[PDB]
Protein backbone atom coordinates (compact mmCIF):
# COMPACT_ATOMS: atom_id res chain seq x y z
CA UNK A 1 0.00 0.00 0.00
CA UNK A 2 1.19 3.55 0.74
CA UNK A 3 3.99 2.35 3.03
CA UNK A 4 5.79 0.30 0.41
CA UNK A 5 5.57 3.00 -2.26
CA UNK A 6 6.83 5.64 0.24
CA UNK A 7 9.70 3.38 1.24
CA UNK A 8 10.66 2.94 -2.41
CA UNK A 9 10.56 6.70 -3.09
CA UNK A 10 12.69 7.29 0.02
CA UNK A 11 15.34 4.89 -1.31
CA UNK A 12 15.33 6.64 -4.70
CA UNK A 13 15.59 10.04 -3.02
CA UNK A 14 18.55 8.95 -0.84
CA UNK A 15 20.48 7.16 -3.59
CA UNK A 16 20.19 10.16 -5.90
CA UNK A 17 21.20 12.47 -3.05
CA UNK A 18 24.29 10.40 -2.32
CA UNK A 19 25.22 10.10 -6.00
CA UNK A 20 24.99 13.87 -6.34
CA UNK A 21 27.12 14.40 -3.19
CA UNK A 22 29.69 11.92 -4.65
CA UNK A 23 29.81 13.92 -7.91
CA UNK A 24 30.53 17.13 -5.87
CA UNK A 25 33.36 15.25 -4.06
CA UNK A 26 34.79 14.24 -7.47
CA UNK A 27 34.53 17.78 -8.86
CA UNK A 28 36.52 19.13 -5.87
CA UNK A 29 38.98 16.31 -5.44
CA UNK A 30 39.35 14.81 -8.95
CA UNK A 31 38.49 11.32 -7.76
CA UNK A 32 35.57 9.57 -6.04
CA UNK A 33 35.97 8.24 -2.48
CA UNK A 34 37.29 4.66 -2.49
CA UNK A 35 35.24 1.81 -1.10
CA UNK A 36 37.36 2.01 2.05
CA UNK A 37 36.89 5.77 2.51
CA UNK A 38 33.20 5.07 2.11
CA UNK A 39 30.16 7.31 2.20
CA UNK A 40 31.62 8.66 5.46
CA UNK A 41 34.04 10.64 3.25
CA UNK A 42 30.97 12.77 2.38
CA UNK A 43 30.66 14.00 5.95
CA UNK A 44 34.21 13.76 7.35
CA UNK A 45 37.48 14.35 5.59
CA UNK A 46 38.94 10.95 4.87
CA UNK A 47 42.45 9.57 4.89
CA UNK A 48 44.21 7.10 2.59
CA UNK A 49 44.34 9.15 0.54
CA UNK A 50 43.66 12.51 2.15
CA UNK A 51 41.84 14.61 -0.48
CA UNK A 52 43.48 17.81 -1.77
CA UNK A 53 40.41 20.09 -1.78
CA UNK A 54 37.97 19.00 0.89
CA UNK A 55 34.98 21.26 1.32
CA UNK A 56 34.39 22.66 4.81
CA UNK A 57 31.43 20.79 6.30
CA UNK A 58 31.54 18.01 3.69
CA UNK A 59 29.20 17.19 0.82
CA UNK A 60 25.95 16.09 2.43
CA UNK A 61 24.29 17.18 5.72
CA UNK A 62 24.03 13.64 7.04
CA UNK A 63 24.15 10.08 5.79
CA UNK A 64 20.62 8.78 5.36
CA UNK A 65 19.54 5.33 6.56
CA UNK A 66 17.63 3.11 4.13
CA UNK A 67 13.89 2.57 4.67
CA UNK A 68 14.61 -0.75 6.46
CA UNK A 69 17.10 0.70 8.95
CA UNK A 70 20.28 -0.33 7.11
CA UNK A 71 23.08 1.84 5.76
CA UNK A 72 23.31 2.40 2.07
CA UNK A 73 26.14 0.48 0.41
CA UNK A 74 28.99 1.83 -1.76
CA UNK A 75 31.70 0.51 -4.07
CA UNK A 76 34.30 2.45 -5.93
CA UNK A 77 35.26 1.23 -8.41
CA UNK A 78 31.81 -0.38 -8.78
CA UNK A 79 30.68 -3.73 -10.22
CA UNK A 80 27.81 -2.08 -12.15
CA UNK A 81 29.37 1.27 -13.12
CA UNK A 82 32.10 3.72 -12.10
CA UNK A 83 30.59 3.85 -8.62
CA UNK A 84 27.88 1.70 -7.08
CA UNK A 85 25.55 3.28 -4.53
CA UNK A 86 22.74 1.01 -3.41
CA UNK A 87 20.38 -0.54 -0.93
CA UNK A 88 19.70 -4.29 -0.84
CA UNK A 89 16.04 -3.67 0.02
CA UNK A 90 13.62 -5.20 2.53
CA UNK A 91 15.35 -8.60 2.70
CA UNK A 92 18.79 -7.07 3.36
CA UNK A 93 20.29 -9.48 0.82
CA UNK A 94 21.51 -9.54 -2.79
CA UNK A 95 18.71 -10.06 -5.36
CA UNK A 96 15.02 -10.50 -4.54
CA UNK A 97 11.66 -9.28 -5.81
CA UNK A 98 9.01 -6.93 -4.45
CA UNK A 99 10.25 -4.77 -1.58
CA UNK A 100 13.20 -7.14 -1.50
CA UNK A 101 14.61 -5.86 -4.77
CA UNK A 102 17.97 -4.10 -4.80
CA UNK A 103 17.87 -0.43 -5.69
CA UNK A 104 21.05 1.27 -6.98
CA UNK A 105 22.32 4.12 -9.08
CA UNK A 106 22.64 1.69 -12.03
CA UNK A 107 18.91 0.85 -12.13
CA UNK A 108 17.44 3.83 -10.27
CA UNK A 109 14.97 4.90 -12.99
CA UNK A 110 13.14 1.59 -12.58
CA UNK A 111 12.12 2.57 -9.01
CA UNK A 112 11.25 6.19 -9.74
CA UNK A 113 7.71 7.17 -10.50
CA UNK A 114 6.43 6.43 -13.98
CA UNK A 115 7.05 9.95 -15.36
CA UNK A 116 10.78 9.25 -15.05
CA UNK A 117 10.64 6.09 -17.17
CA UNK A 118 11.65 5.65 -20.79
CA UNK A 119 9.33 3.32 -22.79
CA1 LIG B 1 17.54 -7.62 -2.07
CL1 LIG C 1 14.93 8.63 -22.09
NA1 LIG D 1 35.37 5.53 9.54
NA1 LIG E 1 26.56 1.62 -10.60
PT1 LIG F 1 28.73 20.60 -3.34
ZN1 LIG G 1 26.74 11.37 -11.28
ZN1 LIG H 1 9.43 12.88 -10.42
ZN1 LIG I 1 7.53 2.45 -16.73
From Swiss-Prot:
Protein's UniProt keywords contain Cell membrane: yes
Annotated localization: Cell inner membrane
PTM summary: Cleaved by the prepilin peptidase.
Record bears the keyword Nucleotide-binding: no
Primary location group: membrane
Keyword terms of this UniProt record: Cell inner membrane, Cell membrane, Membrane, Methylation, Protein transport, Transmembrane, Transmembrane helix, Transport
Membrane topology: Single-pass membrane protein
One GO CC term on file: type II protein secretion system complex
Family in the record: Belongs to the GSP G family.
Subunit structure: Type II secretion system is composed of four main components: the outer membrane complex, the inner membrane complex, the cytoplasmic secretion ATPase and the periplasm-spanning pseudopilus. Forms homomultimers. Interacts with EspL.
Function comment: Core component of the type II secretion system required for the energy-dependent secretion of extracellular factors such as proteases and toxins from the periplasm. Pseudopilin (pilin-like) protein that polymerizes to form the pseudopilus. Further polymerization triggers pseudopilus growth.
UniProt protein name: Type II secretion system core protein G
Amino acid sequence: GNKEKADQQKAVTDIVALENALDMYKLDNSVYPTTDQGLEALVTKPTNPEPRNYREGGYIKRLPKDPWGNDYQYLSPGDKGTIDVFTLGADGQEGGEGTGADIGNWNIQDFQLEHHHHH
